[PDB]
Amino acid sequence: SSENLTSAESRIRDVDMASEMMEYTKNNILTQASQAMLAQANQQPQQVLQLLK
Amino acid sequence: SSENLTSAESRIRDVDMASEMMEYTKNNILTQASQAMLAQANQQPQQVLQLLK
Numbered sequence: 659s660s661e662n663l664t665s666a667e668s669r670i671r672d673v674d675m676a677s678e679m680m681e682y683t684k685n686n687i688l689t690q691a692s693q694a695m696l697a698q699a700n701q702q703p704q705q706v707l708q709l710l711k
Numbered sequence: 712s713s714e715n716l717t718s719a720e721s722r723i724r725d726v727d728m729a730s731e732m733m734e735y736t737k738n739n740i741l742t743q744a745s746q747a748m749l750a751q752a753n754q755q756p757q758q759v760l761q762l763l764k
Contacts, residue, residue: 676762
């Protein structure tokens with residue numbers, strides 16, 4: 659009854675290493691995609707200076 | 712009446728050497744089979760490290 663409950667509690671509490679590392683990598687890329695586009699988002703307002711002169 | 716009772720008591724109390732040595736060897740192997748698989752059971756969780764990097 660300890661094995662059957664230890665296994666029962668592990669499924670509820672312990673994390674799946676495979677299904678979590680794969681999900682961590684996804685959000686670790688989605689933040690770099692937003693990081694890359696944030697840099698370009700700041701460059702866009704810089705083009706009105708050539709028009710203002 | 713002592714021989715007939717000594718033989719009667721030996722069957723009840725004394726062990727059969729053949730039928731017991733053969734049974735001892737069986738459990739002496741079943742514990743080594745579990746010993747061998749316990750070593751491999753510990754190696755299985757070690758493979759997530761190559762995935763985590």
